[PDB]
Ligand binder design. Structure first.
Ligand SMILES: [K+]
Ligand SMILES: [K+]
Ligand SMILES: [Mg+2]
Ligand SMILES: [Mg+2]
Ligand SMILES: [Mg+2]
Ligand SMILES: [Mg+2]
Ligand SMILES: [Mg+2]
Ligand SMILES: [Mg+2]
Ligand SMILES: [Mg+2]
Ligand SMILES: [Mg+2]
Ligand SMILES: [Mg+2]
Ligand SMILES: [Mg+2]
Ligand SMILES: [Mg+2]
Ligand SMILES: [Mg+2]
Ligand SMILES: [Mg+2]
Ligand SMILES: [Mg+2]
Ligand SMILES: [Mg+2]
Ligand SMILES: [Mg+2]
Ligand SMILES: [Mg+2]
Ligand SMILES: [Mg+2]
Ligand SMILES: [Mg+2]
Ligand SMILES: [Mg+2]
Ligand SMILES: [Mg+2]
Ligand SMILES: [Zn+2]
Lengths: 225, 153, 115, 307, 110
RNA sequence: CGAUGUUGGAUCAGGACACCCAAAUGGUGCAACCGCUAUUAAAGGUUCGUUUGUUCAACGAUUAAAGUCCUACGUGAUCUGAG
C-alpha cells in the first residue's frame, strides 16, 4: 500500500468574493497564524465530534467543557465560527463557538469524520438519538492513510412540519430518508423549484485556486520563521 | 439598490437569460462572428471567454463535456470546439475575443449594436481603429525624449 | 426571544407546571420595556386559569456568541418574593445566569445542570 | 471654432503609450520620495503644546472590519483605516479663513494626471506632488501649523485616543418614505387597495398647504456625516493602518476624514501625543511594528484565564 | 385629476424650448481615413463595415454549398482562397473556399 | 342643493396650555414616607390586550405618565365601509 499526501486548508482562510483590498486579508491572515501558534486548532470537518474547553468566570472550576457534533462551519478570517450540537437530559443545546476567541483553552477532536452533507442543520428535526452523544467518550485516533473516511448514515425524520423545507433542491440534502417520511406526490411538487441552469452558469463559480497557492506560502513561511 | 450586481436582467427572467445567451453563444461558435445588441453582446463576452477555458481542459474531462453539452445546443459543434477552437488557442490566456461597437441598426428600434468574434477567424478583418503612426508630429516630439532618456540612463 | 402569547415549557417540579391542562401555558406580559424578553428576564404566565410570574432560562432565538441555544422555550415558575415554587430543575440552565446573584440566588441554588 | 473633443490617448502611437506611462510613473516616485525629510528641508518652527490647541487630521482609506477582543472577554469590532498618501497642501492664514483658527489643507490618495483639470494639475506642479483624489479643510490653531508638503503617517494617532470620522455615507438612491424616514405602512390584506407603503396624509385641511419641514420621498444616503467618540485601539506602523472602534460612515475603499474628537469629555487629550505631528526622522528610533492599547488581547498573548 | 385652466402659449413656449429639451450637438464626428465618409471616433465606420459584411456573406454562402447537410461542420481550420492563388504548405490539411473575384485589397493573405 | 361626500379606526401628524409625566417653588390640619393645594415652564413623551361598528364605558397586565381640546368634531383626488 501507499500513503499519498494531500493538503488541508481551513475554510476561513479562503477570502470571500467581493471588492476588498487584498491588504485587509493579509492583515487578518497574519493575526490568525500568530493565534494558531499558541492555540492548536486541529483539522475537523462537518459531522466530526469535538470537545471545546472555554474559560467561564462564574463556574466553580474556571474551565468549562462541551462535547457535541459540529453542525456547520461558517465565517471568514479572524471571526470564524462553528456550531456544536448535543442533547442532554432530552434537551437539545447548540452553541456557536468562535475559533479565535481568546477564551478558548484547547480544542480536541474525539472523532474525525465527514458526512454526506456540508451543513448538518437538519438534525433539529431529526430523531433525538441522532443528536445524543456521550459526554465522556474516549478519543479515537486514526491513521493518516484513511483520508478522513466518509460516514454514510441516513437519518430518520420527525413528522412535518420541519424547521426548513428540506425537500427543496436548493439545500441538496441526500443524508435524509425521504422515502419513509414523504410520498411521491410531495416529491414532485418540491421539484417545481428546481433550477437546472444554476449548475451550468459558468460565471457564478469562484475560482480561488490561484489565491490558495499564495496563502499556502505564507503559512509555510510562518512555521519556518 | 443594485450595488455589486454584475449580471443583467434580460428576457423573461433568470432562466430566459441563460437561454438567450445559449442561442447567441451557439451562433458565435459556428460562425465565429455575430452581431447583436450591445448589452447582450457584452454579457456574451464573459461566457465566450470561459467556454474556451473549458475547451482547453480536454475531450476526456467529463465536466467540460457536460458543460459544452448544455451551451452548444447544436450537437455538431462539440467536436469543432474540442478540435478547432481549443487547439487554436494555446498561447494567450484571456485574449480570445474582440468586441467593437457597430453603428446603430437601420430600423425603428435604433438599438446599440456590437460585433463579437473569435481571434484568427477565417473571415475578412474588421476595420479596427488604427492608432497614429510614429511619424506624426506629436509622436516625433515624444520620441525625442525617449532617445535622449535612453542615451543617458 | 419570548413575547406576548407564546407557548412555553416549565422545567421545575411543581403541582401547577406538571398537571395536564387543556390549554398550554401562554405568556401574558413581559416586564422588560421592550415587548420581547431574553434569557434571565422576568415574565408573567397564564397557567391553568391563574396568573403566575416566571423567569426565562432558555429560548430558541440565537443570541451572542458562546451562549447556548435550546430547542424549547424553558421558563421557571416564580413568586412575588422571588423564591421559586419548584424544588429542583433537571433541564440544563445557561451558566450566564450566575452573573446576577443578588436576585437569582434562590433560583440558581436549585439548578442541577449548567451549560 | 468647433474644436473636437480629445483625450490623452487619442494621438499617442502604440510605441509611445507605454513610454508616457513610464514617464509619469517615474516622476511620481521621485516626487514622493523627495518629501520624506520634513525636518531636513527647513521646516516651520515647532511650538510646545498649550491648552486648547488643535492638531491636524489625516485622510485615510477604509479597508474593512475585523473582530477584536479585550482583556475582560468582551468582543469589539474595529474598522481598518489605511493612510495611503497624505500630504498637507496649503496653509491659509487665520484672518483669511475664519478669523479664529487657521486652516490647513490635506489631500487624499494619488490619482492619475490625465483626468484632472488644468488648474488642479498646475497647482500641484508648483508644489511638486502628484494629484490627490479628495481634498479637505482642517481647522488648526496657530501653534500647530505645518509647512505644506510635509508627509503624514498613521502614527499621528496614538492608541488610546478618541477620534472622529467624516465621510460620505452609502447612497441608496431615490428611496420611498418608508425606507427613508421609517414611517409605518398600511396593512397588507385587510381590504387595502393600492396602498401599502405610501406616506398617507401629509398635512391638515385648514392650512391648505404643505409645511416646509414635511417628510417626503427623495434622495437618501449620499451626504456627509460624522461619527464622534470612536476610540483608537491599534495602530500599525509599516502599513499605516488605524483601527477605530465601531462603524465609520462610508462604503469600502472610500476616503475618510479623521480628526481628534471634539466632544467635551475628550478635551486637552493631546499633551501625551505628538505635536504638531509625528516626525519619524526626528526620533531616530524605530517604532514597534504594532501599537496596542493596554486593554487589547494581542494575537501572541496567552489565552484568557479568569482565575 | 383634471387641469384647472388652459396653459397660455407664453408658458408653453418656455417649456417646449428649454435647453434641456433641445437636441444637443455632437462634437465626436470624424472622417474615415480609408473611404472619406463620416463616422464617430468610438464607432466603426458604417461604410467600411458594410463593405466587409457583404464580403463575409458571400464567403459564408459558398461554405453552405460545400456542406449540404444542416448539421455538417468541419473538424479542421478553414482558409479562404481567391482567384489566381493556390494553397500554401502551412494551409494544407484545411478546407478550401474558392471565390472567383480577385482578392480584395483590405483582405490580407498570410 | 347645474353636489361643501357623511361615524369610527389605519398612515402622517400641525397647534393651544386651562399640564398627565419629566424640571424649579410657595402653603399645609407638611416630622419622614405617601398625599392634598397654588404659582412658573409646551423642547420631548403620553402602552399593549378581551367584548362592542363603535368614539364612550367596564375589565386584565403594565408604565415616569397612559392629559384636556382645536384643526371642515384634521386627514376617503392616501386606504378601510363593520355602522
Ligand atoms: K349642498
Ligand atoms: K405636545
Ligand atoms: Mg422557523
Ligand atoms: Mg450593475
Ligand atoms: Mg425587458
Ligand atoms: Mg460589462
Ligand atoms: Mg377561568
Ligand atoms: Mg446606489
Ligand atoms: Mg406592514
Ligand atoms: Mg377598487
Ligand atoms: Mg394590495
Ligand atoms: Mg393659507
Ligand atoms: Mg434625486
Ligand atoms: Mg360648480
Ligand atoms: Mg386618528
Ligand atoms: Mg403633535
Ligand atoms: Mg400655566
Ligand atoms: Mg412633575
Ligand atoms: Mg373628518
Ligand atoms: Mg373618514
Ligand atoms: Mg379612492
Ligand atoms: Mg381629501
Ligand atoms: Mg354594510
Ligand atoms: Zn470608412
Amino acid at each position: 500500500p501507499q500513503r499519498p499526501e494531500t493538503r488541508f486548508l481551513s475554510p476561513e482562510f479562503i477570502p470571500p468574493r467581493g471588492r476588498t483590498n487584498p491588504l485587509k486579508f493579509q492583515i487578518e491572515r497574519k493575526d490568525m497564524l500568530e493565534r494558531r501558534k499558541i492555540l492548536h486548532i486541529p483539522e475537523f470537518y462537518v459531522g466530526s465530534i469535538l470537545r471545546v474547553t472555554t474559560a467561564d468566570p462564574y463556574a466553580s472550576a474556571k474551565t468549562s467543557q462541551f462535547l457535541g457534533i459540529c453542525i456547520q462551519r461558517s465565517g471568514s478570517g479572524l471571526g470564524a465560527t462553528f456550531i456544536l450540537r448535543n442533547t442532554i437530559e432530552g434537551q437539545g443545546v447548540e452553541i456557536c463557538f468562535e475559533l479565535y476567541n481568546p477564551r478558548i483553552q484547547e480544542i480536541q477532536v474525539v472523532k474525525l469524520e465527514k458526512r454526506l452533507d456540508n451543513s448538518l442543520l437538519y438534525l433539529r428535526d431529526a430523531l433525538p438519538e441522532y443528536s445524543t452523544f456521550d459526554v465522556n467518550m474516549k478519543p479515537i485516533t486514526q491513521e493518516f492513510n484513511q483520508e478522513v473516511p466518509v460516514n454514510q448514515l441516513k437519518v430518520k425524520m420527525k413528522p412535518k412540519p420541519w424547521s426548513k423545507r428540506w425537500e427543496r433542491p436548493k439545500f441538496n440534502i441526500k443524508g435524509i430518508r425521504f422515502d419513509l417520511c414523504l410520498t411521491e406526490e410531495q416529491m414532485r411538487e418540491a421539484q417545481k423549484w428546481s433550477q437546472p441552469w444554476l449548475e451550468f452558469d459558468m460565471m457564478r463559480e469562484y475560482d480561488t485556486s490561484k489565491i490558495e497557492a499564495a496563502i499556502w506560502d505564507e503559512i509555510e513561511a510562518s512555521k519556518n520563521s | 439598490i443594485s450595488h455589486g450586481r454584475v449580471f443583467r436582467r434580460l428576457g423573461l427572467g433568470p432562466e430566459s437569460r441563460i437561454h438567450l445567451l445559449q442561442n447567441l453563444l451557439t451562433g458565435l461558435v459556428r460562425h465565429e462572428r455575430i452581431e447583436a445588441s450591445w448589452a447582450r453582446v457584452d454579457e456574451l463576452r464573459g461566457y465566450a471567454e470561459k467556454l474556451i477555458d473549458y475547451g482547453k481542459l480536454g475531450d476526456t474531462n467529463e465536466r467540460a463535456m457536460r458543460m459544452a453539452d448544455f451551451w452548444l445546443t447544436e450537437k455538431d459543434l462539440i467536436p469543432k470546439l474540442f478540435q478547432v477552437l481549443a487547439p487554436r488557442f494555446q498561447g494567450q490566456n484571456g485574449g480570445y475575443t474582440r468586441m467593437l461597437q457597430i453603428p446603430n441598426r437601420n430600423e425603428q428600434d435604433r438599438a446599440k449594436m456590437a460585433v463579437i468574434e473569435y481571434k484568427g477567424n477565417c473571415l475578412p478583418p474588421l476595420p479596427l481603429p488604427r492608432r497614429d503612426s510614429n511619424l506624426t508630429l506629436l509622436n516625433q516630439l515624444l520620441q525625442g525624449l525617449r532617445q535622449d532618456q535612453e542615451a543617458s540612463s | 426571544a419570548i413575547q406576548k402569547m407564546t407557548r412555553v415549557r416549565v422545567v421545575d417540579n411543581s403541582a401547577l407546571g406538571t398537571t395536564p391542562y387543556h390549554r398550554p401555558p401562554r405568556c401574558i406580559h413581559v416586564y422588560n420595556k421592550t415587548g420581547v424578553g431574553k434569557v434571565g428576564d422576568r415574565i408573567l404566565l397564564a397557567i391553568r386559569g391563574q396568573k403566575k410570574k416566571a423567569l426565562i432560562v432558555g429560548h430558541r432565538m440565537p443570541g451572542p456568541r458562546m451562549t447556548p441555544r435550546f430547542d424549547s422555550n424553558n421558563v421557571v415558575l416564580l413568586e412575588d418574593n422571588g423564591n421559586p415554587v419548584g424544588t429542583r430543575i433537571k433541564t440544563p440552565i445557561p451558566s450566564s445566569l450566575r452573573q446576577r446573584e443578588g436576585e437569582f440566588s434562590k433560583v440558581l441554588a436549585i439548578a442541577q445542570n449548567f451549560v | 471654432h468647433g474644436k473636437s473633443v480629445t483625450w490623452w490617448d487619442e494621438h499617442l502611437s502604440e510605441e509611445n503609450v507605454p513610454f508616457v506611462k513610464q514617464l509619469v510613473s517615474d516622476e511620481n516616485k521621485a516626487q514622493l520620495a523627495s518629501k520624506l525629510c520634513p525636518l531636513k528641508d527647513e521646516p516651520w518652527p515647532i511650538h510646545p503644546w498649550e491648552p486648547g490647541s488643535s492638531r491636524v487630521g489625516l485622510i485615510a482609506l477604509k479597508l474593512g472590519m475585523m473582530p477584536l477582543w479585550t482583556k475582560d472577554g468582551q468582543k469589539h469590532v474595529v474598522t481598518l483605516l489605511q493612510v495611503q498618501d497624505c500630504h498637507v497642501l496649503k496653509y491659509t492664514p487665520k484672518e483669511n479663513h475664519n478669523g479664529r483658527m487657521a486652516a490647513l489643507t490635506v489631500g487624499g490618495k494619488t490619482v492619475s494626471h490625465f483626468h484632472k483639470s488644468a488648474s488642479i494639475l498646475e497647482f500641484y506642479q508648483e508644489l511638486g506632488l502628484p494629484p490627490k483624489q479628495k481634498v479637505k479643510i482642517f481647522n488648526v490653531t496657530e501653534n500647530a501649523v505645518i509647512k505644506p508638503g510635509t508627509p503624514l503617517y498613521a502614527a499621528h494617532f496614538r492608541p488610546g485616543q478618541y477620534v472622529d470620522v467624516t465621510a460620505k455615507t452609502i447612497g441608496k438612491g431615490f428611496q420611498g418614505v418608508m425606507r427613508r424616514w421609517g414611517f409605518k405602512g398600511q396593512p397588507a390584506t385587510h381590504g387595502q387597495t393600492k396602498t401599502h407603503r405610501r406616506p398617507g396624509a401629509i398635512s391638515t385641511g385648514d392650512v391648505a398647504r404643505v409645511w416646509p419641514g414635511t417628510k417626503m420621498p427623495g434622495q437618501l444616503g449620499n451626504i456627509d456625516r460624522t461619527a464622534f467618540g470612536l476610540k483608537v485601539w491599534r495602530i500599525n506602523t509599516k502599513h499605516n493602518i488605524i483601527y477605530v472602534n465601531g462603524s465609520v460612515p462610508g462604503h469600502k475603499n472610500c476616503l475618510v476624514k479623521i480628526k481628534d474628537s471634539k466632544l467635551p469629555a475628550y478635551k486637552d487629550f493631546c499633551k501625551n501625543l505628538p505635536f504638531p505631528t509625528y516626525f519619524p526622522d526626528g526620533d531616530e528610533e524605530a517604532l514597534p511594528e504594532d501599537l496596542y492599547d493596554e486593554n487589547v488581547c494581542q494575537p501572541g498573548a496567552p489565552s484568557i484565564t479568569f482565575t | 385629476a383634471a387641469p384647472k385652466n388652459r396653459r397660455s402659449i407664453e408658458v408653453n413656449r418656455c417649456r417646449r424650448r428649454n435647453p434641456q429639451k433641445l437636441i444637443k450637438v455632437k462634437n465626436n464626428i470624424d472622417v474615415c481615413p480609408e473611404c472619406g465618409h463620416l463616422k464617430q471616433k468610438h464607432i466603426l465606420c458604417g461604410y467600411c463595415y458594410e463593405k466587409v459584411r457583404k464580403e463575409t456573406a458571400e464567403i459564408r454562402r459558398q461554405m453552405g454549398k460545400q456542406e449540404g447537410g444542416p448539421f455538417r461542420a468541419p473538424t479542421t481550420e478553414t482558409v479562404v482562397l481567391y482567384s489566381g492563388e493556390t494553397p500554401s504548405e502551412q494551409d494544407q490539411g484545411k478546407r478550401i473556399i474558392e471565390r472567383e473575384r480577385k482578392r480584395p485589397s483590405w483582405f490580407t493573405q498570410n
